[PDB]
Amino acid sequence: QQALLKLIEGTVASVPPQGGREFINVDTTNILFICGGAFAGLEKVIRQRTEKGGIGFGASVHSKITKLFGIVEPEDLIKFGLIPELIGRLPVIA
């Protein structure tokens, strides 16, 4: 995740030539990145955030896949396991 931070945001990648191992300088500023995956443990986090509640008298107790993913926020992805620096570089969550 840390290594990708500077590849997704504009850097100059130094990659081997078309032959066997002078390297090529590639400006990644305008390369569009689409990342994705099945964040299998992500629904539990969203439910923990949206249905916190409390235990005991004075406190008040709160009511209890498609719906949960549709309300995902960076707070969930951070608790899931992505780093804030990478989440902010993926501004559009579909």
């Binding site: 509640g53 409390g54 235990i55 005991g56 008298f57 406190a59 107790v61 709160h62 209890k64």
Partner: protein, 186 residues
């Protein structure tokens, strides 16, 4: 006793608590009553809307300890369904009748017994101290009969007669009386 482990590994009672089943087994004491309260509080938060199943197999016990359960049952948002297993006597019958109306159950061969309280504490010391404790016991007696009469949709006068001496009831008699709503078979 060795409490079996079932599959995270639970002891079988923690496993049943996960299903919202709370057991009151044996005498009602400060310690056994506070565990019921702790479980009732815990379950309300895990889900304020789902029913809690309070399984009772108890000969009775302390009134104040039973009242801590009783007030917790009435306070928490989720309905507390009560089931009589084996027996519900004295405060056990009180807590059985205290379940949510329409959700008070008994098993077919269970035994339900209601009676006026005994000593809530000794009556020693001076006649002035004995007077005080006698008055407190009478207030408790009236409070329990009044709450029982409310639970059973009966007159206070009926509970005063019927709790004078140990009144044993079958599940059918308890249903007719108004202590339980249904008798389970299968």
């Amino acid at each position: 006793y060795l409490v079996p482990t079932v599959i995270r590994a639970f002891d079988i009672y923690s496993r049943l608590l996960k299903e919202r089943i709370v057991f009151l087994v044996g005498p009602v004491t400060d310690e056994s009553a506070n565990l019921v309260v702790a479980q009732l509080l815990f379950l309300e938060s895990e889900n304020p809307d789902k029913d809690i199943f309070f399984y009772i197999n108890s000969p009775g016990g302390s009134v104040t300890a039973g009242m801590s359960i009783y007030d917790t049952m009435n306070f928490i948002k989720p309905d507390v369904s009560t089931l009589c297993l084996g027996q519900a006597a004295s405060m056990g019958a009180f807590l059985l009748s205290a379940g949510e109306k329409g959700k008070r159950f008994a098993l077919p061969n269970s035994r339900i017994m209601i009676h006026q309280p005994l000593i809530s504490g000794g009556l020693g010391g001076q006649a002035s101290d004995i007077e005080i404790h006698a008055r407190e016991l009478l207030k408790i007696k009236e409070k329990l009969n009044r709450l029982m009469a409310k639970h059973c949709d009966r007159d206070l006068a009926d509970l005063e007669r019927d709790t004078d001496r140990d009144n044993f009831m079958s599940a059918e008699e308890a249903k007719e009386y108004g202590l339980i709503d249904q008798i389970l078979e299968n």
